[PDB]
């Protein structure tokens, strides 16, 4: 049960700053202490070996540093491609054991987002079923709200929504929405409306469209 | 160069067992000691074991000592994870990890095999076109996409144009509709002028229920 104890769950920096991730082992692990580096929908990454000794290609802004039971990966000149959850290693006893993981947050300038709407598919049509997506495209930061109104009336409990991690480039959001109704429901009504708060937006922005152009 | 590709998603009821597999290429696995770990929701990335291909002894994790058995066949080039009496608590994204000991930590991993515990039933996805229209474009870019609906269980994989497409591609995490089923769009943002002349295909794949789409997502 040597516990590998990384007691920063998130971090927030900036483009160009430095981050220090820490890692407390609960026993004397010496150097054989290792950091990985996992971005979203990707496998670990293997960073620092014998605790500060850099891999083949790893760019030197990555340093780790730390001896016995205090254990550091440094992170200068931040960049976005930075994005990734970091987590510590102890491969000097058996069971090896890993950190919880410390999640990198960029914060960036306010970008408002661009709303697009999606009509059901003429495939899903037939199959009885009606899915209007709207979409938010490159927004920051990551709180928005979407509201659904059918012929101008507020809808409820008949869509889902999901937010995806921080863009690896431009450290913005991106958001789906849908709305399904039985293809029943979705040809007794007009026009089908998504809109959208946020704060790089003055104003409430609403994009619209009528069942049959 | 060297390049592990571990065995696809699998769905397993309680209790069964099941075998991932971990095929190595472009080196010979005697000169390495495989691993396996797995990640879970909370307690997050776990040690399970090693083997070394070049006589068999295996190190485990005694927790799960007695569940898991790792073997290895050289002619192969492949490593075996065997999970027996599966429960609820062994969902997991399971890792297979090659290292040789020079730089001496898993340096090369392979994309991970998604374990889903559960007695309910696979089930396949429909994938709509998110055709490209007015309503999608401005500034001379243009959005389209694939809605993948109505699945079980996780993961569904998307690429486009089999993997030549990546930039201004988001797909979205899943989410959970009230059935039970899982539901996901996948989104790329292109140029509005070449609409005519460029072809995009969203190409979806769900394993557990053998499901290979390649829907040509066209404009209007």
């Known amino acids: 049960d040597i516990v590998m104890t990384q007691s920063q769950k998130f971090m927030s920096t900036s483009v160009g700053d430095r981050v220090s991730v820490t890692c407390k082992a609960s026993?004397?692990?010496?150097?054989?202490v290792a950091w990985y580096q996992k971005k979203p929908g990707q496998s670990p990454k293997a960073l620092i070996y014998?605790?500060?000794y850099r891999y083949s290609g790893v760019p030197d802004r990555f340093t780790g540093s730390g001896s016995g039971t205090d254990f550091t990966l440094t992170i200068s000149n931040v960049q976005s491609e930075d994005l990734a959850e970091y987590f510590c290693?102890?491969?000097?006893?058996?069971?090896?054991?890993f950190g919880g993981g410390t999640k990198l947050e960029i914060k960036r300038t306010v970008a408002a987002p661009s709303v697009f709407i999606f009509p059901p598919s003429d495939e899903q049509l037939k199959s009885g079923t009606a899915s209007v997506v709207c979409l938010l495209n490159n927004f920051y930061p990551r709180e928005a709200k979407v509201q659904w109104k059918v012929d101008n009336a507020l809808q409820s409990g008949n869509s889902q929504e999901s937010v995806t991690e921080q863009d690896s480039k431009d450290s913005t959001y991106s958001l789906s929405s849908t709305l399904t109704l039985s293809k029943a429901d979705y040809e007794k009504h007009k026009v089908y409306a998504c809109e959208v708060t946020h704060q790089g937006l003055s104003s409430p922005v609403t994009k619209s469209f009528n069942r049959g152009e | 160069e060297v390049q592990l590709q571990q065995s696809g998603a699998e769905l397993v009821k309680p209790g069964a067992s099941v075998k991932l597999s971990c095929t190595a290429s472009?080196?010979?696995?005697?000169?390495?000691?495989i691993y396996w770990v797995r990640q879970r929701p909370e307690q997050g990335l776990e040690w399970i074991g090693r083997?070394?291909?070049?006589?068999?002894?295996?190190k485990y994790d005694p927790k799960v000592q007695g569940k898991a058995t790792i073997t290895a066949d050289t002619s192969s080039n492949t490593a075996y994870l065997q999970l027996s009496s599966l429960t609820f608590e062994d969902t997991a994204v399971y890792y297979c990890?090659?290292?040789?000991?020079?730089?001496?930590?898993?340096?090369?991993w392979g994309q991970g095999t998604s374990v889903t515990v559960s007695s309910a039933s696979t089930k396949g996805p429909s994938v709509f076109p998110l055709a490209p229209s007015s309503k999608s474009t401005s500034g001379g870019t243009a959005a389209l996409g694939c809605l993948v609906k109505d699945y079980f269980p996780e993961p569904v994989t998307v690429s486009w144009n089999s993997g030549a497409l990546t930039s201004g591609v988001h797909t979205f995490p899943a989410v959970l509709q009230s059935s039970g089923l899982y539901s996901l769009s996948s989104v790329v943002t292109v140029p509005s002028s070449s609409l005519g002349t460029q072809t995009y295909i969203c190409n979806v794949n769900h394993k557990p229920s053998n499901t290979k789409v390649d829907k040509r997502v066209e404009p209007k």
């Open positions: 990890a090659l290292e040789h000991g020079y730089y001496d930590v898993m340096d090369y």
């Open positions: 472009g080196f010979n696995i005697k000169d390495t000691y």
């Open positions: 083997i070394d291909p070049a006589n068999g002894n295996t």
């Open positions: 026993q004397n692990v010496d150097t054989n």
């Open positions: 014998s605790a500060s």
């Open positions: 290693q102890q491969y000097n006893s058996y069971p090896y054991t």
